[PDB]
Design a protein around this ligand. Sequence first.
Ligand SMILES: *C1=C(N2CCN(C)CC2)C(=O)c2ccccc2C1=O
Ligand SMILES: *C1=C(N2CCN(C)CC2)C(=O)c2ccccc2C1=O
Lengths: 152, 162
Amino acid sequence: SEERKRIDELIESGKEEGMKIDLIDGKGRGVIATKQFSRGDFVVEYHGDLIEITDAKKREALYAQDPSTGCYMYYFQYLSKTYCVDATRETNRLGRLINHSKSGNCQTKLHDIDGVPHLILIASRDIAAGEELLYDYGDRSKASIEAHPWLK
Amino acid sequence: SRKSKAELQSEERKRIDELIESGKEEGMKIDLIDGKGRGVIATKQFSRGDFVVEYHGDLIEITDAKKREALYAQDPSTGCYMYYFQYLSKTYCVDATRETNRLGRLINHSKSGNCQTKLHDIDGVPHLILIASRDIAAGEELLYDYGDRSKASIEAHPWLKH
Ligand SMILES: *C1=C(N2CCN(C)CC2)C(=O)c2ccccc2C1=O
Ligand SMILES: *C1=C(N2CCN(C)CC2)C(=O)c2ccccc2C1=O
């Protein structure tokens, strides 16, 4: 990833330069690059509510009663404990809308600031403008399964 | 009308049987919709009570459905297309997670929609169908209330009750 100071400043400001929401055949919503990114560049935060697993379960019980909701819980482990970034609410933050690929052009990185973990996407290779932004949801999937033993 | 309630039902049942057998889904298209992604749009008129489309997929029982959910959770490209429902003494599920062509799975939720789910029996096999709850004009998004579907999923998933 690029310089830590710069990443911290982007995370704090929430500036989401260089991408747009689009509608994509066979998928629905996705995110399209509107600028070039170099390998290692910060692309965007997977931004939502950072919560612990107890609160995530309760939230999943609410979301299950609300048919408009999509699946936006991103589970992960930080310093032994399980956390979740809950991006279920419709906002203007774009990371939550980035779709899955095994050969995507972004990768998840856990980037902590003063003891608070953030899930961010970094460019895994150079990205041309016009490409759909995509990352491997494998780790996300695994963590979901780990957090719901009834699935497993 | 000279047609009794029972005559209407028999007539409508024949119409629906033939559309299930054929699988024809005329009068609609897959679309991309701002703020939603995929959905289905009416491209002809439908009158209140008309068959619109089947919610087509693999009919399975609850134990099987929960086994499939564990597999779908491993493949991140899967959407949420399990439709649970009660039929007589049992819960079933129409699994449309691996349907391609058949559009019923793609119809979106609303509380103010223009379709209604009905259970249609063909020789003891339950089929989930969508019928028009009012007249629908070409250009309109097809929409039904997922309430019953949502309540049945919760009943099948005790983990999601709390
Ligand atoms: C996606 C889910 N959702 C949220 C609720 N809405 C109605 C459908 C989409 C889940 O409910 C859920 C629960 C447990 C594990 C995984 C998921 C999803 O992937
Ligand atoms: C939607 C789900 N899916 C299938 C798996 N993919 C990866 C995400 C979307 C669920 O997994 C699920 C499980 C239990 C209850 C409800 C749901 C969904 O709504």
